[PDB]
Write a protein that binds this ligand. Structure first.
Ligand SMILES: [Fe+3]
Length: 220
């Protein structure tokens, strides 16, 4: 019970309904989470399978300051492109390999196609360092594709909240053409390899099964 309790404790200290109280506070969460192993959250058995399919979501905690969850992905399964408005997400591969692709908007905010720049397009393999995304940097729009069985540990602050207007919006590449691959933004910054994204409702193909958490109990 040590690790998950120490992790939850650091989150209560470091995270607020406006987000991480500070970068130093956030790094303290990251330092704990970097030491996670499958046994700490009860996934030692799923972790040895590393060698159209439904994804499992384990909710470890939700409150107004932060959310903690784990996605267990079977090979070839996909988390489609989505964003995290106003949110910071700390995230960590527990086991397995996956492909991540992420973007950030080319410009600051003001259902039409909007230009975004590529930030990450790479496979990750355990052990792999914890990643961080911010409201406007670090790849706030991302998608995941499982190579092996894999499991992502996710800390979101603040959590999604549709009544507070922090929805999980899904995105597709715009079919519209005569859209330029290279644009110039504020301060004359040149953005090459632009991708034009538009909101869309995720396909009925996408199934998240909520599954009860069965690891070391958290004392809340
Ligand atoms: Fe996400």
């Amino acid at each position: 019970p040590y690790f998950i309790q120490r992790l939850f404790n650091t989150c209560k200290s470091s995270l607020s309904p406006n987000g991480p109280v500070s970068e130093e506070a956030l790094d303290k969460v990251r330092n704990v989470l970097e030491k996670i192993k499958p046994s700490d959250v009860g996934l030692e058995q799923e972790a040895q399978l590393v060698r159209l399919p439904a994804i499992k979501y384990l909710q470890l905690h939700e409150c107004d300051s932060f959310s903690i969850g784990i996605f267990c992905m079977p090979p070839g399964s996909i988390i489609p492109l989505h964003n995290h408005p106003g949110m910071t997400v700390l995230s960590k591969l527990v086991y397995g390999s996956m492909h991540v692709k992420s973007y950030d908007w080319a410009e600051p905010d003001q259902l039409q196609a909007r230009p975004a720049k590529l930030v990450k397009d790479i496979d990750m393999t355990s052990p792999s360092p914890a990643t961080t995304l911010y409201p406007t940097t670090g790849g706030n729009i991302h998608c995941f594709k499982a190579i092996t069985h894999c499991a992502i540990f996710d800390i979101l602050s603040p959590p999604y909240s549709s009544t507070h207007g922090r929805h999980c919006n899904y995105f597709r590449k715009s079919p519209m053409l005569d859209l330029p691959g290279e644009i110039e933004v504020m301060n004359g910054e040149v953005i090459s390899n632009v991708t034009w994204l538009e909101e869309y409702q995720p396909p009925d193909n996408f199934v998240i099964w909520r599954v009860p958490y069965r690891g070391p109990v958290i004392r809340k």
